[PDB]
Design a protein around this nucleic acid. Structure first.
Lengths: 297, 98, 119, 226
RNA sequence: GGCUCUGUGGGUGCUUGGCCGCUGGCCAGACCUACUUCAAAGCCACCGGGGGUACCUACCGGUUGGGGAAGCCCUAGCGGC
RNA sequence: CGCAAGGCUGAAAAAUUGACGGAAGGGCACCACCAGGGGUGGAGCCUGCGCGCGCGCUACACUGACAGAGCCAGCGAGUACUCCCUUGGCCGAGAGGCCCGGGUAAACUCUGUCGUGCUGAGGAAUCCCUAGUAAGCGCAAGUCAUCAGCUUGCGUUGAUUACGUCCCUGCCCUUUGUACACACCGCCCGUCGCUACUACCGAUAGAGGAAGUAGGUCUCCGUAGGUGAACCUGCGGAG
């Protein structure tokens, strides 16, 4: 099994590098197809390449399929997108506190298909090993400061990305009394994402919305009574968890049911939780000059 | 990896299973076997709305009941059950004043 | 290629052909038909053979030594011992080619690593 | 999957390798899987808790069989050994090391002595008796073994074929058939055929599992099912 | 006395003779070269992919000059259609 | 540069598909039952959140103290790491450097010496937990966010009790679909909307109000015609 995970990760990295070179060529091939249909004259370096024309005659059709959106990009999520229900386990750090364990339970209840695991004495490579051995889609690690959580680590499996984020303004479910709160409904939640516009924003949108099981698309625009909101300002994604009734065709009553975060991501690594030496995709550039001026996501 | 599954339909007849059997001097089945007609009674005849009469309806039980003999309460309840399945899937001054 | 470019059966059989060749390990990408133009190659089949793929997996040192070892019969692919040095190892059986049960080559590797368990 | 529903119930998981043998218990309560992670699993599916008790073995699992009175199970590994486990308290109660009892070999295209050929020294398939007292075991070899499950002895060994047109039916080939160009049953003699459809070799290079070309000259002896 | 190397014979599949121009002969061989009525039925027959086609070849349709099997007819001929 | 760029104005629907339920039957859950375990809450310290609240940390004795003997880990190596500040004196024209004072485990195992002695294990509640899990123990690191009032790893020792059931509390879903054989089941229920039609009521042909329903082949012969020997067609007869 382990040889298959290593081999498939190496094949994925090689295919991504080949896609970089092929994109450098296919930016030139899309000018030849647009000039053929519209008749505007093109560059001589493009029109006088015999290899480009000879291979263009075979590779028209994938460019047309990408224009129509009929195919999907080579990704770690596009293999099993809406086919499998993504199972995900939430774990603490090594010796958790009682409020960290209740918070772990609360963000377990945020996902309708998640499970929680007691860490105890569990070495982190064997944690990764057991996740790949039970075909989990995601793990989420939690770190507390002193009864208040300060970091999440959302890792996608078998070889997918980590998003490590630091938590702020955490208002737990376990602070309000049982007369006012209650047992959270476990229905498949709607999701809304607000303010993600860069390709890095669509990356974090993908690795956050593939944590939830896929919604049945027959009548999802009106059915379902539970929503989860990820909205970012100043690249600190703030998340709420509401439950709603549609009290009229023009009005809706919301009710806050879950914990509130404003998590800020500081590391997105193309590689799982065990790989400390995985190649990062983005990291929070503090101690640079304009790293506080520039806004990502 | 085998192939993507593409739909293929097979036309079976109403002959007995000893017509699907291979060629040999006598059958392997007994005398009771050999009358099984290779399509079930549900494929010989199934009562449904597309093969019902004009005045009558067929219920979920497969029983013809007519709309004339059906009462108002049962008509209302059958309408409610079908609707439940569907849900699961310048003038004059006198005219102004007076 | 000679089919028109917006054709449904052209697109479906392009994806089928590229997925079949990438699953057999001949092509290294599954997103270009020019790979089947000038990258599918009898050398690509011949390097998907067994002694070259275990040379790459470093089961042997050279393809000559690998052909000698799989003629003497130390190498199984999966669960069955392989005596034919032309057995084309696909991309998901390159994860299952390994030594046989009572192999002297396996005892040599364990004796080098000082893990020679005689049980 | 479910038979009366038709759609997929579950994907059970916990194996670190491809799963080679499956067996549902004849009373109906326990699935047992056996896989090349050197492991077996007592899956309990039908209870309200769905649980998996592992049985750690010494090599890759090749076959799994139940006793008819379901308290016992025999799993045959790649070392060539049969291990008789209990299913209630998951402990091995019995075992046979059966390499020598099934090792009969030396095919053509085999440069080892028949005693040193590994690959024909395991039991690919095993079945209990309908009594439940004797296993029957057969692999990729000439011999079928019939073991006793209580006294752990080989009651009787059989030879499947005397046919020398098959390849692995005698463990000591004679040196009369070895020319200076390899064995005599190895030279390609298709060219001395009167008919073209017999002369044409439409065979694929390196195809162990079937090709429609299928030269198939001197096929091996193997018992693929008992 | 021991290791190694090499050679011959038997065995490594159920035991019916050596040879020939073989119903008979021979193992020391013998005789040497005859006899003849009417050439033949057709088909298939594996070169890696895309492309060129001036020349050669294959297939198909024709053109000049000769050739006449066979079919048809009758004024009968060295005939005629 | 042109259009956008002129205020019956003055803040707080759709529906033959819709709105809300009920009853029955399933599935699941340490936010449920059942059996146990462990926190917090009592005293002190303090980060944090808004004097209060918890989260950690410490003290609180049989599981004792003292002295010996023996025996066990894993992660950890950037010419890099250091706990203060000072009384004196050395060599110091001066700035400093010296010297001397003051403030690779824990655990475990075995053998002896003494014996409960301000020398006291946390209420109501509330929360969490089902196997290398709870709990004890130390060692190491400090990785662009968080974290020294701590964080995260890493090894060591390692149990009790459930592992059943939807009875309580709930959550999800069936009563439409999504496949066909065996086999089984057999029209779930209510309050309204919308649409179509029908008639009613009363003010000025008309917008409203209120309601209901949904059977002669073959051969021959005699004929008559055709293109004549023959031969063809049609008919009438016999075999």
């Amino acid at each position: 099994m382990l040889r298959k995970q290593a081999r498939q990760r190496r094949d994925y990295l090689y295919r991504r590098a080949l896609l970089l070179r092929d994109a450098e060529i296919a930016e030139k091939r899309a000018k030849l197809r647009a000039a053929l249909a519209s008749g505007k004259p093109l560059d001589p370096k493009i029109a006088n390449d015999k290899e480009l024309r000879k291979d263009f005659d075979y590779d028209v059709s994938r460019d047309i399929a990408k224009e129509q959106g009929e195919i999907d990009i080579d990704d770690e999520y596009s293999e099993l997108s809406g086919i499998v229900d993504p199972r995900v386990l939430v774990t603490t750090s090594r010796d958790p506190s009682s409020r960290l364990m209740a918070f772990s339970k609360e963000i377990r209840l945020m996902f309708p298909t998640a499970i929680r695991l007691n860490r105890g004495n569990l070495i982190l490579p064997d944690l990764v090993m057991s996740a790949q051995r039970e075909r989990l889609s995601d793990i989420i690690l939690l770190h507390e400061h002193r009864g208040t959580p300060t970091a999440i680590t959302i890792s996608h499996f078998p070889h997918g990305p980590t998003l490590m984020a630091s938590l702020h303004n955490v208002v737990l479910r376990a602070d309000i009394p049982k007369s006012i709160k209650g047992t959270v409904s476990e229905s498949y939640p709607h999701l809304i994402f607000e303010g993600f516009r860069t390709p890095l924003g669509q990356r974090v949108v993908k690795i956050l919305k593939h944590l939830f099981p896929p919604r049945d698309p027959t009548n999802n625009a009106k059915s379902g009574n539970r929503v989860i909101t990820f909205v970012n300002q100043d690249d600190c994604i703030e998340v709420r968890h509401h439950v709603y009734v549609r009290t009229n065709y023009n009005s809706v009553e919301l009710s806050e049911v879950g914990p509130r975060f404003t998590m800020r991501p500081f590391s997105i690594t193309m590689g799982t939780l065990e790989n400390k030496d995985a190649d990062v995709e983005w990291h929070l550039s503090q101690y640079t000059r304009t790293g506080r001026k520039k806004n990502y996501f | 990896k085998p192939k993507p599954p593409a739909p293929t339909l097979t036309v079976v007849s109403d002959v007995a299973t000893v017509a699907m059997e291979d060629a040999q001097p006598a059958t392997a089945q007994g005398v009771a076997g050999g009358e099984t007609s290779m399509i079930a009674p549900q494929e010989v005849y199934a009562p449904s709305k597309d093969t019902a009469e004009k005045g009558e309806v067929v219920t979920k039980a497969g029983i013809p009941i007519a709309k004339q003999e059906m009462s108002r309460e049962e008509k209302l309840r059958r309408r409610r059950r079908e609707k439940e399945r569907i849900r699961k899937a310048v003038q004059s001054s006198g005219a102004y004043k007076l | 290629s000679l089919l028109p470019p917006d054709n449904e059966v052209r697109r479906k059989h392009e994806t089928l052909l590229l997925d079949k060749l990438y699953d057999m390990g001949i092509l290294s990408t599954k997103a270009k038909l020019s790979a089947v133009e000038h990258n599918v190659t009898v050398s690509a089949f011949a390097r998907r053979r067994l002694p070259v793929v275990m040379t790459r997996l470093r089961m042997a040192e050279t393809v000559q030594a690998a052909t000698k070892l799989i003629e003497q019969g130390h190498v199984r692919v999966g669960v069955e011992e392989v005596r034919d040095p032309a057995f084309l190892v696909t991309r998901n059986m390159e994860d299952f080619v390994t030594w046989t049960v009572g192999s002297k080559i396996k005892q040599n590797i364990m004796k080098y690593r000082d893990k020679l368990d005689d049980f | 999957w479910s038979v009366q529903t038709g759609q997929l119930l579950d994907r059970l998981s916990g194996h670190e390798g491809p799963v080679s043998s499956l067996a549902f218990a004849p009373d109906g309560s326990v699935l047992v899987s056996g896989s090349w992670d050197r492991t077996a699993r007592i899956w309990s599916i039908f209870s309200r808790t769905q649980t998996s008790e592992p049985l750690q073995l010494q090599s890759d699992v090749l076959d799994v069989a139940f006793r008819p009175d379901s308290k016992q199970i025999a799993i045959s590994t790649l070392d060539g050994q049969l291990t008789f486990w209990s299913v209630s308290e998951a402990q091995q109660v019995s075992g046979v090391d059966g390499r020598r009892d099934v090792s009969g070999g030396r095919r053509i295209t085999d440069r080892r002595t028949a005693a040193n050929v590994a690959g024909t020294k395991n039991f690919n398939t095993i079945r209990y008796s309908m009594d439940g007292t004797c296993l029957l075991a057969g692999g990729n070899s000439k011999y079928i073994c019939l073991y006793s499950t209580t006294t752990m002895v080989l009651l009787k060994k059989f030879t499947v074929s005397v046919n020398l047109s098959l390849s692995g039916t005698q463990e000591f080939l004679n040196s009369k058939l070895m020319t200076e160009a390899g064995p005599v049953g190895l030279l390609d003699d298709q060219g001395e055929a009167s008919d073209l459809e017999d002369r044409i070799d439409r065979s694929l290079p390196g195809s162990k599992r079937g090709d429609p070309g299928a030269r198939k000259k001197f096929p091996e002896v193997r018992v693929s099912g008992v």
